[PDB]
Amino acid sequence: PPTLASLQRLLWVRQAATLNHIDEVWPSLFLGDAYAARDKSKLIQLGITHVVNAAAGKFQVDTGAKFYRGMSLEYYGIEADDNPFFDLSVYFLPVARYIRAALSVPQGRVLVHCAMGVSRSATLVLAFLMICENMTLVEAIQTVQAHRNICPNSGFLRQLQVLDNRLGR
């Protein structure tokens, strides 16, 4: 039963020197920022077929389905705030189902992006790994941080920590 303080240490302790705009943190599952989400060329190059925008809203990254009209990808917008009291857990299961289905397809290439692809987005991926990949919160973080510096809100961590106890049983 990892403590919150522990999880935080784990996150900061093993960080790489730099952070790219996007990284494949799991086979065909990418974590990225708003710069990558708006770069259509890049998305076409990586063959992205699905985009989960965890920072939707006209006051955040207002891309939306319209933005990808030409490309033939699936859009999933989530109006989430990145503060420790926002309830992101309510999207853990529906997003995990969404990722799973997308990755069950040969072409399937999923990009989960935040404004910085380090908190909201990362939290959804961790939830996906825990739920569909049978990983504990610890294993999930280890899996992802080996490919991208991530740092979910202390609140998101608390939520993931609660998910971990639920899945554990």
Side-chain angles (χ1 to χ4, degrees):
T3 69
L4 190 65
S6 288
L7 295 175
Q8 302 185 301
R9 285 178 152 188
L10 175 55
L11 291 172
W12 120 281
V13 170
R14 297 259 55 178
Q15 290 207 188
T18 67
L19 180 80
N20 302 309
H21 289 120
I22 181 168
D23 301 290
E24 188 175 4
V25 302
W26 180 250
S28 293
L29 218 194
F30 305 71
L31 267 174
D33 56 39
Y35 177 82
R38 289 179 169 290
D39 185 351
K40 293 172 190 173
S41 167
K42 177 169 298 185
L43 269 41
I44 298 165
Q45 289 189 308
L46 294 168
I48 283 47
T49 62
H50 290 72
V51 174
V52 176
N53 175 13
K58 60 158 57 186
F59 298 128
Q60 299 192 297
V61 299
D62 188 60
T63 48
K66 314 282 187 178
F67 188 79
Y68 305 105
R69 186 159 66 185
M71 317 152 93
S72 195
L73 57 70
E74 308 309 309
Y75 181 79
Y76 186 159
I78 299 178
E79 295 185 54
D81 303 338
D82 182 27
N83 69 275
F85 294 91
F86 180 81
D87 192 348
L88 191 57
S89 76
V90 73
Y91 300 92
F92 290 176
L93 200 65
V95 167
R97 288 205 187 81
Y98 186 89
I99 305 294
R100 188 219 293 135
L103 299 178
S104 66
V105 145
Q107 311 89 310
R109 256 58 163 177
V110 176
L111 165 60
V112 180
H113 83 81
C114 171
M116 288 304 293
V118 160
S119 179
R120 276 169 295 187
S121 57
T123 297
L124 297 179
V125 169
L126 294 174
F128 164 74
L129 296 179
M130 293 166 70
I131 301 174
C132 310
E133 252 45 58
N134 194 217
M135 291 191 196
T136 61
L137 210 190
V138 171
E139 304 170 315
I141 290 166
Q142 288 173 161
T143 297
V144 178
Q145 69 179 177
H147 294 92
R148 185 186 179 68
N149 291 167
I150 60 167
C151 191
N153 290 321
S154 58
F156 290 172
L157 284 180
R158 174 52 181 168
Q159 289 165 50
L160 284 179
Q161 199 184 18
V162 169
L163 180 63
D164 193 54
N165 171 98
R166 244 217 177 207
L167 294 184
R169 183 188 63 189

mmCIF file of all heavy atoms in Angstrom, residues 29-80:
data_model
loop_
_atom_site.group_PDB
_atom_site.id
_atom_site.type_symbol
_atom_site.label_atom_id
_atom_site.label_comp_id
_atom_site.label_asym_id
_atom_site.label_seq_id
_atom_site.Cartn_x
_atom_site.Cartn_y
_atom_site.Cartn_z
ATOM 1 N N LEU A 29 0.359 3.794 -27.652
ATOM 2 C CA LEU A 29 -0.308 4.745 -26.764
ATOM 3 C C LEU A 29 0.689 5.870 -26.502
ATOM 4 O O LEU A 29 1.761 5.653 -25.933
ATOM 5 C CB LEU A 29 -0.695 4.078 -25.436
ATOM 6 C CG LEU A 29 -2.030 4.462 -24.767
ATOM 7 C CD1 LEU A 29 -2.035 3.952 -23.331
ATOM 8 C CD2 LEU A 29 -2.240 5.953 -24.775
ATOM 9 N N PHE A 30 0.330 7.074 -26.922
ATOM 10 C CA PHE A 30 1.196 8.228 -26.748
ATOM 11 C C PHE A 30 0.656 9.236 -25.746
ATOM 12 O O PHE A 30 -0.556 9.414 -25.616
ATOM 13 C CB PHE A 30 1.385 8.944 -28.085
ATOM 14 C CG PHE A 30 1.888 8.061 -29.187
ATOM 15 C CD1 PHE A 30 1.066 7.084 -29.753
ATOM 16 C CD2 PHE A 30 3.185 8.204 -29.664
ATOM 17 C CE1 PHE A 30 1.535 6.266 -30.784
ATOM 18 C CE2 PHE A 30 3.661 7.389 -30.697
ATOM 19 C CZ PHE A 30 2.835 6.421 -31.253
ATOM 20 N N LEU A 31 1.577 9.885 -25.038
ATOM 21 C CA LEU A 31 1.238 10.943 -24.096
ATOM 22 C C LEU A 31 1.885 12.197 -24.683
ATOM 23 O O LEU A 31 3.072 12.183 -25.035
ATOM 24 C CB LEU A 31 1.809 10.648 -22.705
ATOM 25 C CG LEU A 31 0.883 9.908 -21.730
ATOM 26 C CD1 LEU A 31 1.643 9.567 -20.457
ATOM 27 C CD2 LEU A 31 -0.328 10.773 -21.399
ATOM 28 N N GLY A 32 1.108 13.267 -24.820
ATOM 29 C CA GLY A 32 1.650 14.492 -25.385
ATOM 30 C C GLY A 32 1.006 15.775 -24.889
ATOM 31 O O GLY A 32 0.024 15.754 -24.133
ATOM 32 N N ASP A 33 1.561 16.903 -25.324
ATOM 33 C CA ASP A 33 1.066 18.216 -24.927
ATOM 34 C C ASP A 33 0.188 18.839 -26.001
ATOM 35 O O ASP A 33 -0.072 18.223 -27.029
ATOM 36 C CB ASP A 33 2.234 19.158 -24.635
ATOM 37 C CG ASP A 33 3.186 19.279 -25.803
ATOM 38 O OD1 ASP A 33 2.717 19.320 -26.957
ATOM 39 O OD2 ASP A 33 4.408 19.342 -25.574
ATOM 40 N N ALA A 34 -0.253 20.071 -25.755
ATOM 41 C CA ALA A 34 -1.105 20.790 -26.691
ATOM 42 C C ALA A 34 -0.359 21.170 -27.968
ATOM 43 O O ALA A 34 -0.978 21.352 -29.015
ATOM 44 C CB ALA A 34 -1.687 22.038 -26.031
ATOM 45 N N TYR A 35 0.963 21.297 -27.890
ATOM 46 C CA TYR A 35 1.737 21.622 -29.079
ATOM 47 C C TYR A 35 1.648 20.447 -30.051
ATOM 48 O O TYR A 35 1.480 20.638 -31.252
ATOM 49 C CB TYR A 35 3.205 21.902 -28.728
ATOM 50 C CG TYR A 35 4.077 22.176 -29.945
ATOM 51 C CD1 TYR A 35 4.119 23.450 -30.527
ATOM 52 C CD2 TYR A 35 4.831 21.157 -30.537
ATOM 53 C CE1 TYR A 35 4.887 23.701 -31.663
ATOM 54 C CE2 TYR A 35 5.602 21.399 -31.673
ATOM 55 C CZ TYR A 35 5.623 22.673 -32.228
ATOM 56 O OH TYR A 35 6.381 22.923 -33.351
ATOM 57 N N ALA A 36 1.752 19.229 -29.526
ATOM 58 C CA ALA A 36 1.669 18.040 -30.364
ATOM 59 C C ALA A 36 0.244 17.836 -30.881
ATOM 60 O O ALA A 36 0.046 17.447 -32.029
ATOM 61 C CB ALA A 36 2.123 16.817 -29.579
ATOM 62 N N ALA A 37 -0.744 18.117 -30.037
ATOM 63 C CA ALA A 37 -2.150 17.953 -30.410
ATOM 64 C C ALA A 37 -2.610 18.902 -31.517
ATOM 65 O O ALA A 37 -3.581 18.619 -32.225
ATOM 66 C CB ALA A 37 -3.036 18.134 -29.179
ATOM 67 N N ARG A 38 -1.922 20.029 -31.660
ATOM 68 C CA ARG A 38 -2.274 21.007 -32.682
ATOM 69 C C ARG A 38 -1.439 20.849 -33.949
ATOM 70 O O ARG A 38 -1.746 21.426 -34.988
ATOM 71 C CB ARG A 38 -2.118 22.424 -32.124
ATOM 72 C CG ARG A 38 -3.173 22.792 -31.083
ATOM 73 C CD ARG A 38 -2.958 24.200 -30.537
ATOM 74 N NE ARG A 38 -4.091 24.667 -29.736
ATOM 75 C CZ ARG A 38 -5.288 24.981 -30.231
ATOM 76 N NH1 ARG A 38 -5.518 24.884 -31.536
ATOM 77 N NH2 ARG A 38 -6.260 25.388 -29.423
ATOM 78 N N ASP A 39 -0.387 20.048 -33.854
ATOM 79 C CA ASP A 39 0.498 19.801 -34.986
ATOM 80 C C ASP A 39 -0.065 18.629 -35.810
ATOM 81 O O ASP A 39 0.295 17.470 -35.590
ATOM 82 C CB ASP A 39 1.909 19.493 -34.453
ATOM 83 C CG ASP A 39 2.947 19.343 -35.556
ATOM 84 O OD1 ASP A 39 2.575 19.307 -36.752
ATOM 85 O OD2 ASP A 39 4.150 19.251 -35.212
ATOM 86 N N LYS A 40 -0.956 18.940 -36.748
ATOM 87 C CA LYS A 40 -1.573 17.915 -37.593
ATOM 88 C C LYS A 40 -0.569 17.075 -38.382
ATOM 89 O O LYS A 40 -0.761 15.871 -38.564
ATOM 90 C CB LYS A 40 -2.549 18.551 -38.579
ATOM 91 C CG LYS A 40 -3.773 19.158 -37.942
ATOM 92 C CD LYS A 40 -4.571 19.924 -38.979
ATOM 93 C CE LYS A 40 -5.665 20.737 -38.338
ATOM 94 N NZ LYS A 40 -6.334 21.600 -39.353
ATOM 95 N N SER A 41 0.486 17.718 -38.873
ATOM 96 C CA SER A 41 1.516 17.021 -39.630
ATOM 97 C C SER A 41 2.084 15.903 -38.773
ATOM 98 O O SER A 41 2.113 14.741 -39.183
ATOM 99 C CB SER A 41 2.634 17.986 -40.020
ATOM 100 O OG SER A 41 3.772 17.283 -40.487
ATOM 101 N N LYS A 42 2.527 16.264 -37.575
ATOM 102 C CA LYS A 42 3.095 15.299 -36.646
ATOM 103 C C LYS A 42 2.135 14.130 -36.403
ATOM 104 O O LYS A 42 2.540 12.966 -36.462
ATOM 105 C CB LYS A 42 3.436 15.992 -35.326
ATOM 106 C CG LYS A 42 3.978 15.076 -34.251
ATOM 107 C CD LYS A 42 4.530 15.881 -33.081
ATOM 108 C CE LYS A 42 5.702 16.757 -33.524
ATOM 109 N NZ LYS A 42 6.345 17.470 -32.376
ATOM 110 N N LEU A 43 0.867 14.446 -36.145
ATOM 111 C CA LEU A 43 -0.148 13.422 -35.894
ATOM 112 C C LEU A 43 -0.319 12.484 -37.080
ATOM 113 O O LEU A 43 -0.511 11.280 -36.906
ATOM 114 C CB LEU A 43 -1.488 14.079 -35.533
ATOM 115 C CG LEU A 43 -1.723 14.315 -34.033
ATOM 116 C CD1 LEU A 43 -0.454 14.801 -33.377
ATOM 117 C CD2 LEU A 43 -2.859 15.304 -33.827
ATOM 118 N N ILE A 44 -0.242 13.030 -38.288
ATOM 119 C CA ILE A 44 -0.366 12.210 -39.489
ATOM 120 C C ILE A 44 0.873 11.318 -39.630
ATOM 121 O O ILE A 44 0.786 10.174 -40.064
ATOM 122 C CB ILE A 44 -0.491 13.088 -40.742
ATOM 123 C CG1 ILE A 44 -1.751 13.947 -40.643
ATOM 124 C CG2 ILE A 44 -0.523 12.217 -41.981
ATOM 125 C CD1 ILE A 44 -1.789 15.076 -41.629
ATOM 126 N N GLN A 45 2.023 11.851 -39.244
ATOM 127 C CA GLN A 45 3.269 11.110 -39.339
ATOM 128 C C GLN A 45 3.300 9.901 -38.429
ATOM 129 O O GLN A 45 3.852 8.864 -38.788
ATOM 130 C CB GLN A 45 4.453 12.004 -38.985
ATOM 131 C CG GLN A 45 4.778 13.072 -40.002
ATOM 132 C CD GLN A 45 6.089 13.775 -39.681
ATOM 133 O OE1 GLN A 45 6.291 14.248 -38.557
ATOM 134 N NE2 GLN A 45 6.987 13.850 -40.668
ATOM 135 N N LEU A 46 2.726 10.047 -37.239
ATOM 136 C CA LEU A 46 2.704 8.964 -36.263
ATOM 137 C C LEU A 46 1.501 8.046 -36.467
ATOM 138 O O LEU A 46 1.313 7.071 -35.733
ATOM 139 C CB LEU A 46 2.678 9.545 -34.851
ATOM 140 C CG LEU A 46 3.899 10.323 -34.352
ATOM 141 C CD1 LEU A 46 3.522 11.048 -33.066
ATOM 142 C CD2 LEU A 46 5.081 9.374 -34.118
ATOM 143 N N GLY A 47 0.691 8.367 -37.466
ATOM 144 C CA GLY A 47 -0.483 7.571 -37.749
ATOM 145 C C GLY A 47 -1.536 7.572 -36.651
ATOM 146 O O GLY A 47 -2.256 6.585 -36.493
ATOM 147 N N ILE A 48 -1.645 8.664 -35.897
ATOM 148 C CA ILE A 48 -2.645 8.729 -34.832
ATOM 149 C C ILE A 48 -4.048 8.600 -35.402
ATOM 150 O O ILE A 48 -4.401 9.265 -36.374
ATOM 151 C CB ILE A 48 -2.567 10.054 -34.005
ATOM 152 C CG1 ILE A 48 -1.401 9.999 -33.016
ATOM 153 C CG2 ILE A 48 -3.839 10.215 -33.156
ATOM 154 C CD1 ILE A 48 -0.117 9.512 -33.597
ATOM 155 N N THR A 49 -4.845 7.749 -34.769
ATOM 156 C CA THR A 49 -6.215 7.499 -35.196
ATOM 157 C C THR A 49 -7.199 7.951 -34.125
ATOM 158 O O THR A 49 -8.396 8.075 -34.389
ATOM 159 C CB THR A 49 -6.439 5.999 -35.429
ATOM 160 O OG1 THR A 49 -6.244 5.291 -34.195
ATOM 161 C CG2 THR A 49 -5.452 5.468 -36.456
ATOM 162 N N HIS A 50 -6.686 8.174 -32.914
ATOM 163 C CA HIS A 50 -7.499 8.592 -31.775
ATOM 164 C C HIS A 50 -6.823 9.680 -30.935
ATOM 165 O O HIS A 50 -5.634 9.602 -30.627
ATOM 166 C CB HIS A 50 -7.796 7.393 -30.865
ATOM 167 C CG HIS A 50 -8.730 6.389 -31.465
ATOM 168 N ND1 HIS A 50 -8.358 5.545 -32.485
ATOM 169 C CD2 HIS A 50 -10.037 6.130 -31.215
ATOM 170 C CE1 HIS A 50 -9.397 4.809 -32.845
ATOM 171 N NE2 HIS A 50 -10.427 5.147 -32.091
ATOM 172 N N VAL A 51 -7.606 10.682 -30.545
ATOM 173 C CA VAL A 51 -7.110 11.788 -29.738
ATOM 174 C C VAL A 51 -8.014 12.011 -28.538
ATOM 175 O O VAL A 51 -9.201 12.329 -28.687
ATOM 176 C CB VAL A 51 -7.069 13.113 -30.546
ATOM 177 C CG1 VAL A 51 -6.675 14.278 -29.628
ATOM 178 C CG2 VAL A 51 -6.084 12.990 -31.695
ATOM 179 N N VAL A 52 -7.455 11.832 -27.350
ATOM 180 C CA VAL A 52 -8.212 12.061 -26.135
ATOM 181 C C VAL A 52 -7.624 13.355 -25.600
ATOM 182 O O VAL A 52 -6.459 13.399 -25.208
ATOM 183 C CB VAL A 52 -8.029 10.906 -25.126
ATOM 184 C CG1 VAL A 52 -8.756 11.220 -23.831
ATOM 185 C CG2 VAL A 52 -8.575 9.609 -25.723
ATOM 186 N N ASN A 53 -8.425 14.416 -25.646
ATOM 187 C CA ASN A 53 -8.006 15.733 -25.180
ATOM 188 C C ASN A 53 -8.553 15.951 -23.775
ATOM 189 O O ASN A 53 -9.747 16.180 -23.594
ATOM 190 C CB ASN A 53 -8.535 16.813 -26.130
ATOM 191 C CG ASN A 53 -8.241 18.231 -25.640
ATOM 192 O OD1 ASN A 53 -7.447 18.432 -24.724
ATOM 193 N ND2 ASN A 53 -8.877 19.219 -26.266
ATOM 194 N N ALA A 54 -7.664 15.866 -22.789
ATOM 195 C CA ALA A 54 -8.030 16.035 -21.391
ATOM 196 C C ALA A 54 -8.003 17.485 -20.922
ATOM 197 O O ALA A 54 -8.035 17.750 -19.725
ATOM 198 C CB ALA A 54 -7.116 15.203 -20.522
ATOM 199 N N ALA A 55 -7.933 18.422 -21.855
ATOM 200 C CA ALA A 55 -7.930 19.831 -21.499
ATOM 201 C C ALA A 55 -8.870 20.572 -22.451
ATOM 202 O O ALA A 55 -8.566 21.670 -22.910
ATOM 203 C CB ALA A 55 -6.506 20.401 -21.587
ATOM 204 N N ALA A 56 -10.012 19.958 -22.744
ATOM 205 C CA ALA A 56 -11.002 20.552 -23.642
ATOM 206 C C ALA A 56 -11.635 21.783 -23.003
ATOM 207 O O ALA A 56 -11.480 22.015 -21.807
ATOM 208 C CB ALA A 56 -12.083 19.523 -23.987
ATOM 209 N N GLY A 57 -12.352 22.564 -23.806
ATOM 210 C CA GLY A 57 -12.989 23.768 -23.296
ATOM 211 C C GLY A 57 -12.491 24.996 -24.036
ATOM 212 O O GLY A 57 -11.311 25.071 -24.378
ATOM 213 N N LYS A 58 -13.370 25.964 -24.281
ATOM 214 C CA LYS A 58 -12.973 27.173 -25.005
ATOM 215 C C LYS A 58 -11.902 28.016 -24.309
ATOM 216 O O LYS A 58 -11.275 28.868 -24.944
ATOM 217 C CB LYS A 58 -14.196 28.055 -25.301
ATOM 218 C CG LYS A 58 -14.955 28.538 -24.073
ATOM 219 C CD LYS A 58 -15.783 29.783 -24.382
ATOM 220 C CE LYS A 58 -16.762 29.552 -25.523
ATOM 221 N NZ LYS A 58 -17.468 30.810 -25.912
ATOM 222 N N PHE A 59 -11.686 27.781 -23.015
ATOM 223 C CA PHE A 59 -10.684 28.539 -22.275
ATOM 224 C C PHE A 59 -9.393 27.754 -22.071
ATOM 225 O O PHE A 59 -8.428 28.262 -21.498
ATOM 226 C CB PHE A 59 -11.267 29.002 -20.938
ATOM 227 C CG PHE A 59 -12.453 29.919 -21.093
ATOM 228 C CD1 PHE A 59 -13.646 29.663 -20.420
ATOM 229 C CD2 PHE A 59 -12.388 31.025 -21.943
ATOM 230 C CE1 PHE A 59 -14.761 30.492 -20.597
ATOM 231 C CE2 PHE A 59 -13.495 31.859 -22.126
ATOM 232 C CZ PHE A 59 -14.684 31.591 -21.451
ATOM 233 N N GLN A 60 -9.388 26.512 -22.552
ATOM 234 C CA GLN A 60 -8.218 25.640 -22.475
ATOM 235 C C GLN A 60 -7.805 25.332 -23.918
ATOM 236 O O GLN A 60 -7.734 26.245 -24.744
ATOM 237 C CB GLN A 60 -8.561 24.353 -21.718
ATOM 238 C CG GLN A 60 -9.011 24.602 -20.290
ATOM 239 C CD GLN A 60 -9.068 23.338 -19.461
ATOM 240 O OE1 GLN A 60 -9.836 22.418 -19.748
ATOM 241 N NE2 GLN A 60 -8.249 23.287 -18.418
ATOM 242 N N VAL A 61 -7.523 24.073 -24.238
ATOM 243 C CA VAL A 61 -7.156 23.753 -25.617
ATOM 244 C C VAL A 61 -8.442 23.499 -26.417
ATOM 245 O O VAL A 61 -8.979 22.390 -26.445
ATOM 246 C CB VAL A 61 -6.186 22.530 -25.691
ATOM 247 C CG1 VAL A 61 -4.904 22.850 -24.934
ATOM 248 C CG2 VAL A 61 -6.832 21.295 -25.110
ATOM 249 N N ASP A 62 -8.939 24.558 -27.052
ATOM 250 C CA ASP A 62 -10.173 24.488 -27.825
ATOM 251 C C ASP A 62 -9.984 23.980 -29.250
ATOM 252 O O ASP A 62 -10.186 24.716 -30.217
ATOM 253 C CB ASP A 62 -10.849 25.866 -27.855
ATOM 254 C CG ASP A 62 -12.236 25.829 -28.491
ATOM 255 O OD1 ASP A 62 -13.117 25.104 -27.970
ATOM 256 O OD2 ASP A 62 -12.443 26.527 -29.512
ATOM 257 N N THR A 63 -9.596 22.717 -29.377
ATOM 258 C CA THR A 63 -9.410 22.106 -30.686
ATOM 259 C C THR A 63 -10.753 21.536 -31.120
ATOM 260 O O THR A 63 -11.437 22.111 -31.965
ATOM 261 C CB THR A 63 -8.365 20.970 -30.634
ATOM 262 O OG1 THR A 63 -8.658 20.100 -29.532
ATOM 263 C CG2 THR A 63 -6.962 21.540 -30.478
ATOM 264 N N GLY A 64 -11.133 20.409 -30.529
ATOM 265 C CA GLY A 64 -12.402 19.789 -30.863
ATOM 266 C C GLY A 64 -12.399 19.032 -32.178
ATOM 267 O O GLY A 64 -11.471 19.147 -32.979
ATOM 268 N N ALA A 65 -13.455 18.256 -32.399
ATOM 269 C CA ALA A 65 -13.601 17.466 -33.614
ATOM 270 C C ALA A 65 -13.342 18.293 -34.873
ATOM 271 O O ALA A 65 -12.607 17.866 -35.762
ATOM 272 C CB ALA A 65 -14.998 16.861 -33.661
ATOM 273 N N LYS A 66 -13.952 19.475 -34.937
ATOM 274 C CA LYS A 66 -13.811 20.386 -36.074
ATOM 275 C C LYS A 66 -12.357 20.521 -36.529
ATOM 276 O O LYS A 66 -12.054 20.480 -37.726
ATOM 277 C CB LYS A 66 -14.311 21.785 -35.700
ATOM 278 C CG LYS A 66 -15.641 21.839 -34.963
ATOM 279 C CD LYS A 66 -16.828 21.651 -35.894
ATOM 280 C CE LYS A 66 -18.140 21.892 -35.153
ATOM 281 N NZ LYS A 66 -19.326 21.757 -36.049
ATOM 282 N N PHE A 67 -11.469 20.698 -35.556
ATOM 283 C CA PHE A 67 -10.044 20.879 -35.810
ATOM 284 C C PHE A 67 -9.393 19.772 -36.645
ATOM 285 O O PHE A 67 -8.493 20.043 -37.435
ATOM 286 C CB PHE A 67 -9.301 21.014 -34.479
ATOM 287 C CG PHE A 67 -7.863 21.392 -34.627
ATOM 288 C CD1 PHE A 67 -7.499 22.710 -34.866
ATOM 289 C CD2 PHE A 67 -6.867 20.425 -34.548
ATOM 290 C CE1 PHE A 67 -6.165 23.065 -35.019
ATOM 291 C CE2 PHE A 67 -5.524 20.769 -34.702
ATOM 292 C CZ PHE A 67 -5.173 22.091 -34.939
ATOM 293 N N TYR A 68 -9.847 18.535 -36.477
ATOM 294 C CA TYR A 68 -9.276 17.407 -37.209
ATOM 295 C C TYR A 68 -10.103 16.970 -38.421
ATOM 296 O O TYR A 68 -9.855 15.902 -38.990
ATOM 297 C CB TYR A 68 -9.102 16.214 -36.259
ATOM 298 C CG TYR A 68 -8.295 16.535 -35.019
ATOM 299 C CD1 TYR A 68 -8.916 16.698 -33.780
ATOM 300 C CD2 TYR A 68 -6.914 16.718 -35.093
ATOM 301 C CE1 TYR A 68 -8.181 17.038 -32.650
ATOM 302 C CE2 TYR A 68 -6.175 17.059 -33.976
ATOM 303 C CZ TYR A 68 -6.809 17.217 -32.760
ATOM 304 O OH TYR A 68 -6.068 17.559 -31.650
ATOM 305 N N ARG A 69 -11.067 17.798 -38.819
ATOM 306 C CA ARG A 69 -11.954 17.483 -39.937
ATOM 307 C C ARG A 69 -11.309 16.718 -41.086
ATOM 308 O O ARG A 69 -11.800 15.664 -41.500
ATOM 309 C CB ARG A 69 -12.606 18.760 -40.483
ATOM 310 C CG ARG A 69 -13.653 18.499 -41.567
ATOM 311 C CD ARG A 69 -14.622 19.667 -41.718
ATOM 312 N NE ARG A 69 -13.970 20.877 -42.209
ATOM 313 C CZ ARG A 69 -14.578 22.053 -42.335
ATOM 314 N NH1 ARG A 69 -15.857 22.178 -42.002
ATOM 315 N NH2 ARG A 69 -13.913 23.101 -42.805
ATOM 316 N N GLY A 70 -10.209 17.237 -41.607
ATOM 317 C CA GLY A 70 -9.579 16.541 -42.711
ATOM 318 C C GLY A 70 -9.091 15.139 -42.380
ATOM 319 O O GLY A 70 -9.466 14.177 -43.042
ATOM 320 N N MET A 71 -8.234 15.028 -41.369
ATOM 321 C CA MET A 71 -7.690 13.743 -40.942
ATOM 322 C C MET A 71 -8.864 12.874 -40.525
ATOM 323 O O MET A 71 -9.900 13.395 -40.103
ATOM 324 C CB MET A 71 -6.760 13.968 -39.761
ATOM 325 C CG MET A 71 -5.873 15.179 -39.961
ATOM 326 S SD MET A 71 -5.383 15.958 -38.423
ATOM 327 C CE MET A 71 -3.819 15.128 -38.140
ATOM 328 N N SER A 72 -8.712 11.559 -40.624
ATOM 329 C CA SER A 72 -9.814 10.669 -40.268
ATOM 330 C C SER A 72 -9.603 10.009 -38.910
ATOM 331 O O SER A 72 -9.529 8.783 -38.805
ATOM 332 C CB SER A 72 -9.984 9.602 -41.354
ATOM 333 O OG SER A 72 -11.224 8.934 -41.226
ATOM 334 N N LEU A 73 -9.511 10.825 -37.865
ATOM 335 C CA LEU A 73 -9.299 10.304 -36.525
ATOM 336 C C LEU A 73 -10.487 10.522 -35.600
ATOM 337 O O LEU A 73 -11.375 11.325 -35.876
ATOM 338 C CB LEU A 73 -8.034 10.921 -35.918
ATOM 339 C CG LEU A 73 -7.901 12.445 -35.805
ATOM 340 C CD1 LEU A 73 -8.860 12.988 -34.750
ATOM 341 C CD2 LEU A 73 -6.464 12.790 -35.436
ATOM 342 N N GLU A 74 -10.503 9.794 -34.495
ATOM 343 C CA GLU A 74 -11.582 9.916 -33.537
ATOM 344 C C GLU A 74 -11.182 10.873 -32.427
ATOM 345 O O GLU A 74 -10.075 10.801 -31.902
ATOM 346 C CB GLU A 74 -11.917 8.541 -32.971
ATOM 347 C CG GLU A 74 -12.152 7.528 -34.062
ATOM 348 C CD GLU A 74 -13.152 8.026 -35.076
ATOM 349 O OE1 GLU A 74 -14.248 8.473 -34.665
ATOM 350 O OE2 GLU A 74 -12.844 7.969 -36.281
ATOM 351 N N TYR A 75 -12.096 11.771 -32.077
ATOM 352 C CA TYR A 75 -11.847 12.764 -31.048
ATOM 353 C C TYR A 75 -12.672 12.503 -29.798
ATOM 354 O O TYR A 75 -13.849 12.166 -29.888
ATOM 355 C CB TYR A 75 -12.205 14.142 -31.577
ATOM 356 C CG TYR A 75 -11.962 15.243 -30.588
ATOM 357 C CD1 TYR A 75 -10.677 15.734 -30.382
ATOM 358 C CD2 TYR A 75 -13.014 15.799 -29.856
ATOM 359 C CE1 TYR A 75 -10.433 16.756 -29.480
ATOM 360 C CE2 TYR A 75 -12.782 16.829 -28.938
ATOM 361 C CZ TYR A 75 -11.486 17.301 -28.761
ATOM 362 O OH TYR A 75 -11.230 18.326 -27.884
ATOM 363 N N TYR A 76 -12.052 12.670 -28.637
ATOM 364 C CA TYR A 76 -12.733 12.476 -27.364
ATOM 365 C C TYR A 76 -12.298 13.612 -26.443
ATOM 366 O O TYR A 76 -11.211 13.586 -25.875
ATOM 367 C CB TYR A 76 -12.349 11.124 -26.776
ATOM 368 C CG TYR A 76 -13.082 10.720 -25.515
ATOM 369 C CD1 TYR A 76 -13.146 9.382 -25.138
ATOM 370 C CD2 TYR A 76 -13.661 11.666 -24.671
ATOM 371 C CE1 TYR A 76 -13.763 8.997 -23.956
ATOM 372 C CE2 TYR A 76 -14.279 11.287 -23.478
ATOM 373 C CZ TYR A 76 -14.322 9.952 -23.131
ATOM 374 O OH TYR A 76 -14.895 9.559 -21.948
ATOM 375 N N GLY A 77 -13.156 14.611 -26.311
ATOM 376 C CA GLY A 77 -12.834 15.753 -25.482
ATOM 377 C C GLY A 77 -13.326 15.629 -24.060
ATOM 378 O O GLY A 77 -14.422 15.125 -23.815
ATOM 379 N N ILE A 78 -12.497 16.082 -23.123
ATOM 380 C CA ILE A 78 -12.826 16.048 -21.707
ATOM 381 C C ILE A 78 -12.500 17.403 -21.100
ATOM 382 O O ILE A 78 -11.351 17.856 -21.136
ATOM 383 C CB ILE A 78 -12.025 14.957 -20.973
ATOM 384 C CG1 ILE A 78 -12.370 13.588 -21.563
ATOM 385 C CG2 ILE A 78 -12.344 14.983 -19.483
ATOM 386 C CD1 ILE A 78 -11.615 12.448 -20.953
ATOM 387 N N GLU A 79 -13.516 18.060 -20.555
ATOM 388 C CA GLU A 79 -13.318 19.366 -19.942
ATOM 389 C C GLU A 79 -12.867 19.201 -18.500
ATOM 390 O O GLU A 79 -13.657 19.305 -17.566
ATOM 391 C CB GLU A 79 -14.608 20.179 -20.015
ATOM 392 C CG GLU A 79 -15.009 20.509 -21.442
ATOM 393 C CD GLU A 79 -16.212 21.423 -21.515
ATOM 394 O OE1 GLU A 79 -16.171 22.505 -20.889
ATOM 395 O OE2 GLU A 79 -17.193 21.060 -22.202
ATOM 396 N N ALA A 80 -11.581 18.936 -18.329
ATOM 397 C CA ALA A 80 -11.018 18.744 -17.010
ATOM 398 C C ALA A 80 -10.089 19.891 -16.642
ATOM 399 O O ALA A 80 -9.393 20.439 -17.498
ATOM 400 C CB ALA A 80 -10.258 17.428 -16.965
#
